[PDB]
From Swiss-Prot, chain A:
Note from the entry: The postsynaptic actions of L-glutamate are mediated by a variety of receptors that are named according to their selective agonists. This receptor binds AMPA (quisqualate) > L-glutamate > kainate.
PTM description: Palmitoylated. Depalmitoylated upon L-glutamate stimulation. Ubiquitinated by RNF167, leading to its degradation.
Description of how the protein assembles with itself and partners: Homotetramer or heterotetramer of pore-forming glutamate receptor subunits. Tetramers may be formed by the dimerization of dimers. May interact with MPP4. Forms a ternary complex with GRIP1 and CSPG4. Interacts with ATAD1 in an ATP-dependent manner. ATAD1-catalyzed ATP hydrolysis disrupts binding to ATAD1 and to GRIP1 and leads to AMPAR complex disassembly. Interacts with GRIP2. Interacts with GRIP1. Interacts with NSF via its C-terminus. Interacts with CACNG2, PICK1 and GRIP2. Interacts with GRIA1 and SYNDIG1. Part of a complex containing GRIA2, NSF and NAPA and/or NAPB.
Described purpose of this protein according to its UniProt entry: Ionotropic glutamate receptor that functions as a ligand-gated cation channel, gated by L-glutamate and glutamatergic agonists such as alpha-amino-3-hydroxy-5-methyl-4-isoxazolepropionic acid (AMPA), quisqualic acid, and kainic acid. L-glutamate acts as an excitatory neurotransmitter at many synapses in the central nervous system and plays an important role in fast excitatory synaptic transmission.
Domain notes: The M4 transmembrane segment mediates tetramerization and is required for cell surface expression.
UniProt family annotation: Belongs to the glutamate-gated ion channel (TC 1.A.10.1) family. GRIA2 subfamily.
Induction data: Down-regulated in the pyramidal cell layer of CA1 in the hippocampus by global ischemia.
Tissue and organ expression note: Detected in forebrain. Detected in dendrites of neuronal cells. Expressed in the pyramidal cell layers of CA1 and CA3 and in the granule cell layer of the dentate gyrus.
Originating organism: Rattus norvegicus (Rat)
Superkingdom classification of source: Eukaryota
Subcellular location: Cell membrane; Postsynaptic cell membrane; Postsynaptic density membrane
Protein name (database record): Glutamate receptor 2
């Protein structure tokens, strides 16, 4: 069911949240 | 000409943080000081 999604941190398309060092899951992006 | 020109002629929190000459403060004990202390945003 789940899809494997590939990305790169090329802002503003994909960028980690504030204090992402402690953030994980789909929420960190 | 320049006299004629004379007569004729902070906007956010980030602009406040950038300006160090202007001083800003909060209540000593309150949700505001705690919110700033526990915040993780750069500004």
């Amino acid at each position: 069911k789940t899809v494997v999604v590939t990305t790169i941190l090329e802002s503003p398309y994909v960028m980690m949240k504030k204090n992402h060092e402690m953030l994980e899951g789909n929420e960190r992006y | 000409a320049n006299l004629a020109a004379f007569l004729t002629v902070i906007e956010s929190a980030e602009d406040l943080s950038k300006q160090t000459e202007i001083a800003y403060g909060t209540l000593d004990s309150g949700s505001t000081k705690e919110f700033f202390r526990r915040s993780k945003i750069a500004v």
